[PDB]
Amino acid sequence: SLVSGEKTNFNHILRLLNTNVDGKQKVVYALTQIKGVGRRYSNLVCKKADVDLKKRAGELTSEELERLVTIIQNPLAYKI
């Protein structure tokens, strides 16, 4: 009768650097949903970010969310 639901709340709106509205479709679909960011560049971001593509939005904890945030602010000190 006591089953932990520490992950079941995921299907909701997320705020980001430009948009405040973001549901869950895919990690690369959300990063394409971000304005000015395309599909292949988004694939580059996730492979550099070590975040697994198989996962979805809402499945991602704080430090790696903000890691994606930092590496979408700066694309140069991380090599490109």
């Binding site: 009768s1 006591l2 089953v3 932990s4 639901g5 079941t8 709340n9 909701h12 709106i13």
Partner: protein, 451 residues
């Protein structure tokens, strides 16, 4: 005794130099024994600098009072240092000892724990050692997370001082010694407060905490509210149970918890316990209805906590929203209900929450609490009244709210926006009758004599 202290520190200097360098050796060690006595005196004297001198010569003893490479230092003499530290009334001595040495070094931590074990094996000193155990807070995570030693990082590679399980074992033995000699009521309270964060992690096997915690938890009341944190801790880490958990919580939540100071931590445990997945609608409706009847007597600084949580529970289960909106379906019961008003089938003071009939109740509590003297409380029930737009209301923006917070809010408002006043003031503010003005008197004057 300042020149005595100067002679003492120069004596430590020449002692560590003669050790680091190296029929006569008997007196050469007699010097060090009488110096142990002299350092006991200078520690009972400044005492902080004498303690620095003590740790320095303890390092020198480990370093060069042996023929092996193995740096053994006197556990006995260190235990005497431990005893005089815990017996001396100098709180600054104890603070310097804790911060500068024990909060830094793992050798000092472990051998301190074993010295505590012996020293408590053999009330003021109880409170001193208790405050030191409370001063030790952080738990290392791994054997390579230990990674700092005052003396002799061992090349054994299976050393007990190298093994993190032995450190938790020795701290655990010191803690078992303290609890078995028995601690005060308030000491027990502080342990039950800070247990799950810095004590219950420090145990290899906290199952004796399972026993003592279920004791002080079935005792009842505020101590059970404090003990619930450790019960949930053990349920997470080493998943032993309780027979009927949610019914025990149903009995546990009562009138005075909304005025308790530990209600914030309790509410956080409440949110995760009712944020578990496999819960029935009758059970969550039971908890909602009881906390509603309690909200009829709650502080506003607790109402602001409880009702966004109500919003989230209505989100996480939509079937209980007939307590939000119950439509009579048939005109027959419509006629019966306009004939005689509906009675609440909710059974207060009922034992088991799954068999309380909070199903088919309604939240007349919140439709009344809408008319509250506080405007943000009026709005925080109005969010229940209006619409379910937002996906989630976080609880950290409503916990840690008190009347202090509300007063500093109204104080951190503007110094004055141009306000409004009540016009046509009666002159009969304190007049008992005022029967020629036809204005009804102040009831405070009608019930309080002013003469």
């Amino acid at each position: 005794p300042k020149w005595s202290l100067a002679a003492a520190e120069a004596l430590c200097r020449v002692f560590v130099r003669l050790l680091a360098a190296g029929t006569i050796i008997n007196w050469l060690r007699d010097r060090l024994s009488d110096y142990d006595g002299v350092l006991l005196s200078m520690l009972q004297s400044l005492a902080v600098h004498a303690l620095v001198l003590a740790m320095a010569v303890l390092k020198a003893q480990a370093q060069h009072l042996t023929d092996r490479e193995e740096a053994i230092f006197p556990r006995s003499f260190f235990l005497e240092i431990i005893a005089v530290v815990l017996e001396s009334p100098i709180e600054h001595l104890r603070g310097h000892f804790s911060e500068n040495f024990v909060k830094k070094y793992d050798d000092i931590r472990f051998y301190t724990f074993e010295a505590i074990k012996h020293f408590l094996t053999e009330e003021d000193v109880r409170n001193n050692v208790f405050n030191l155990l409370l001063s030790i807070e952080d738990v290392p995570e791994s054997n390579d997370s230990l990674e700092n030693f005052f003396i002799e990082r061992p090349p054994k590679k299976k050393h007990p001082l190298l093994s993190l399980s032995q450190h938790k074992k020795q701290a655990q033995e010191a803690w078992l010694a303290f609890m078995h000699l028995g601690l005060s009521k308030e000491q027990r309270k502080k342990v039950l407060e800070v247990m799950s964060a810095s004590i219950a992690p420090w145990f290899t096997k906290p199952e004796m905490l399972m026993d003592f915690l279920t004791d002080c938890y079935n005792s009842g009341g505020s101590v059970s509210l404090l003990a619930l944190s450790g019960v949930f801790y053990l349920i997470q880490e080493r998943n032993l149970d309780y027979p009927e958990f949610y019914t025990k919580l149903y009995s546990l939540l009562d009138a005075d918890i909304l005025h308790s100071k530990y209600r914030s931590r309790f509410f956080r445990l409440l949110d995760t316990f009712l944020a578990s997945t496999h819960l029935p609608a009758v059970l969550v409706a039971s908890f909602i209805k009881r906390l509603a009847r309690l909200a009829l007597n709650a502080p506003p600084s607790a109402i602001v906590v409880i009702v966004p949580w109500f919003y989230n529970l209505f989100k996480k289960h939509p079937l209980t929203t007939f307590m939000m909106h119950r439509v009579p379906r048939t005109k027959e019961e419509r006629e019966k209900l306009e004939k005689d008003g509906l009675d609440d089938p909710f059974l207060p003071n009922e034992t088991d929450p799954m068999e309380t009939r909070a199903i088919d109740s309604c939240l007349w509590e919140i439709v009344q609490l809408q008319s509250h003297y506080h405007p943000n409380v009026a709005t925080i029930c109005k969010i229940i009244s209006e619409q379910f737009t937002k996906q989630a209301y976080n609880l950290e923006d409503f916990l840690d709210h008190s009347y202090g917070s509300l007063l500093e809010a109204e104080m951190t408002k503007e110094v004055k926006k141009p306000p409004v006043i009540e016009f046509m003031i009666p002159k009969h503010i304190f007049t008992k009758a005022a029967p020629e003005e036809e204005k009804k008197d102040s009831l405070l004057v009608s019930l309080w004599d002013f003469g």
